């Protein structure tokens, strides 16, 4: 029912990229009154276009936007890294509310296309390991903390090792998350008992990413 | 100068009403060019108009999907309006956005939705709500290298998400980065919120972070100073 729209888009910098939506005759082939949302992850979305080819006040001239048929287009030119978000496309539409009587207004939204740029310089994550605190510990609950932070491209193979042997059980790994800068972050979660804990040297974080390897390493003391 | 200031986000029942409030600053409801609309984002999904109300005409209108479980109200006292969805089943589930819709002129039918608001979570679910526990995530010779110092605070077993953390009441905001969740097996998430400063504050300076679980009306406020 929402207007079609490719899950993703890619282009390099400096190029421009366009973003074709689908509607039909009661929306966008019929109405003039088509729109663009910018929605980065994950704050709210922000128009961009509307009345199919109009910017709202404060958007650069890179965003531009046309319609033909039931179909509208969003072309963004002179791309940027900072043009890395959702963009949806909305129409004015109109439909029955029950079965008969006067159509009532309504507006409908597209599935969003996700834009990627191309030739973003790799970046190798910040890694921290914390141990469990004294209060945890006298909870009765003990976790390890590793948090990996600011790596690009959102590829990231996360071990946890007991001493110097791996470890699969009471492992809990977020999956990444983008970040402003277009970089990506992500968290893991070593769950033991305080007898686990004291009963062993050491706890080790092992993080790859892109050929390059970081373990962390901490012991209870 | 159009400013929209949503409800505090929240855990609702199974067929329960869900009801959310939008405060305006900046404009007028009683206004003649906008409509006030409320549009949903169900997670890892596209946007859905849900419905809209014209104050003018007093005439509100809805997205059939819903089965004509949504209504939209306005309180002028306060220059806010409300959404209130009835029967909530897990479909229901999302964040919640209410906009402001202008149009290029009155004659024109549609617009498009310049205003947003910064969204409401809703989660539906049976299960109770939980306040969350805050360990203080200490530096040390381990979370340092060279001038700078990682100091966090490790927010575990809460539920429903969001939870709002800030480092000294929201005035230390450099070099504060809080991660995503996790989703333990038990249905309780967890977070960490970590801090990068100088390595020559830590004795000196304190940090205070200040954790706030709106779902369940909880707010801790955890010192965290070096091991010792």
């Known amino acids: 029912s929402a207007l079609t729209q490719p899950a993703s888009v890619s282009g390099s910098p400096g190029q421009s990229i366009s973003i074709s939506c689908t509607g039909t005759?009661?929306?966008?082939?019929?109405?003039?009154?088509v729109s663009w949302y910018q929605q980065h992850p994950g704050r709210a979305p922000k128009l961009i276009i509307y009345?199919?080819?109009k910017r709202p006040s404060g958007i650069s001239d890179r965003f531009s936007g046309s319609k033909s048929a039931n179909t509208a287009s969003l072309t963004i030119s002179g791309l940027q890294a900072g043009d890395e978000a959702s963009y949806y496309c909305?129409?004015?539409?109109?439909?029955?509310?029950?079965?008969?009587?006067?159509?009532?207004?309504?507006?409908?939204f597209g599935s969003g296309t996700q834009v990627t740029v191309l030739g973003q310089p790799k970046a190798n994550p910040t890694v921290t390991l914390f141990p469990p605190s004294s209060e945890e510990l006298q909870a009765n609950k003990a976790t390890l903390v590793c948090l990996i932070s600011d790596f690009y491209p959102g590829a990231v193979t996360v071990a946890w090792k007991a001493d110097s042997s791996p470890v699969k059980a009471g492992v809990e790994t977020t999956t990444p998350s983008k970040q402003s800068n277009n970089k990506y972050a992500a968290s893991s979660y070593l769950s033991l008992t305080p007898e686990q804990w004291k009963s062993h040297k050491s706890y080790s974080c092992q993080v790859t990413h892109e050929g390059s390897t970081v373990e962390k390493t901490v012991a209870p003391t | 100068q159009v400013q929209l200031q949503q409800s505090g986000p929240g855990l609702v029942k199974p067929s329960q009403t869900l009801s959310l409030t939008c405060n305006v600053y900046?404009?007028?409801?009683?206004?003649?060019?906008?409509?006030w609309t409320w549009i949903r984002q169900h997670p890892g999904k596209g946007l859905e108009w849900i419905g809209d109300?014209?104050?003018?005409?007093?005439?509100?209108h809805y997205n059939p999907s819903l089965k004509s479980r949504a209504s939209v109200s306005v309180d002028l006292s306060r220059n806010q309006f409300t959404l209130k969805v009835t029967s909530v089943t897990t479909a229901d589930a999302a964040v919640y956005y209410c906009?402001?819709?202008?149009?290029?002129?009155?004659?024109?039918?549609?617009?498009?939705?310049?205003?947003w608001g910064r969204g409401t979570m809703v989660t539906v679910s049976s299960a109770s709500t939980k306040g969350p526990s805050v360990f203080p995530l200490a530096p040390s010779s381990k979370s340092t290298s060279g001038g700078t110092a990682a100091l966090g605070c490790l927010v575990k077993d809460y539920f429903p998400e969001p939870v709002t953390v800030s480092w000294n009441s929201g005035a230390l905001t450099s070099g504060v980065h809080t991660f995503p969740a996790v989703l333990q097996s038990s249905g309780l998430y967890s977070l960490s919120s970590v801090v990068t400063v100088p390595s020559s504050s830590l004795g000196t300076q304190t940090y205070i972070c200040n954790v706030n679980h709106k779902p369940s009306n909880t707010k801790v406020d955890k010192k965290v100073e070096p091991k010792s």
């Open positions: 906009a402001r819709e202008a149009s290029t002129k009155i004659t024109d039918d549609g617009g498009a939705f310049d205003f």
């Open positions: 909305s129409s004015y539409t109109t439909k029955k509310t029950s079965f008969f009587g006067p159509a009532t207004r309504a507006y409908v």
């Open positions: 005759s009661s929306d966008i082939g019929g109405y003039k009154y």
């Open positions: 900046g404009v007028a409801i009683s206004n003649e060019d906008y409509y």
């Open positions: 109300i014209y104050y003018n005409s007093g005439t509100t």
């Open positions: 009345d199919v080819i």
